[PDB]
Design a protein around this nucleic acid. Structure first.
Length: 49
DNA sequence: GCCGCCCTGGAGAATCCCGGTGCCGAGGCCGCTCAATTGGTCGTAGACAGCTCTAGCAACCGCTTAAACGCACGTACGCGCTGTCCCCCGCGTTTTAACCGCCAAGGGGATTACTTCCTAGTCTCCAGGCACGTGTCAGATATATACATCC
């Protein structure tokens, strides 16, 4: 609603526990498929990528 | 008949043991004598209580990730053996100086007692240096925007 209706499509940050991480990823992939949701874990090289 | 040679007995001297007496090491006793003891007084060091704030601790969690661990291989090094030669050890001989016992006088230093005075302890008062907190300021850093240029 913030991205589409109010045109606030800027950078948003969501900080979640690691154990609940796929439960947010599938929710983003299902409910809002047009969003540019990105993932941030890994070692130093994955985060550099 | 006279002279020379072999066998055996008792008295004189050396040695072991015991008693009386004098000398070395140590302990009891006495005398000085100074430092430990006793008794009293008082100040304060520390024990105790109380409140506040911070670190540690037992037992659990979760995540990351680098260190630890296990294994295989290979090769370098510890170790054993042998040779060799050289240098240290044992011994005999000669020297030499350490060691002990001596001057010869003089100064250094340890005590005992005494005198004196300078300097450091102690007390009171005060002030500024140290510890803590904060406003402000100049150097370092990151980016906004305008100009020259290659394809």
């Amino acid at each position: 609603w913030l991205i589409f209706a109010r045109r606030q499509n800027g950078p948003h940050i969501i900080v979640v526990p690691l154990s609940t991480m796929p439960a947010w990823l599938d929710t983003f992939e299902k409910w809002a498929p047009d969003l540019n949701c990105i993932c941030y874990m890994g070692n130093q090289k994955s985060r550099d990528t």
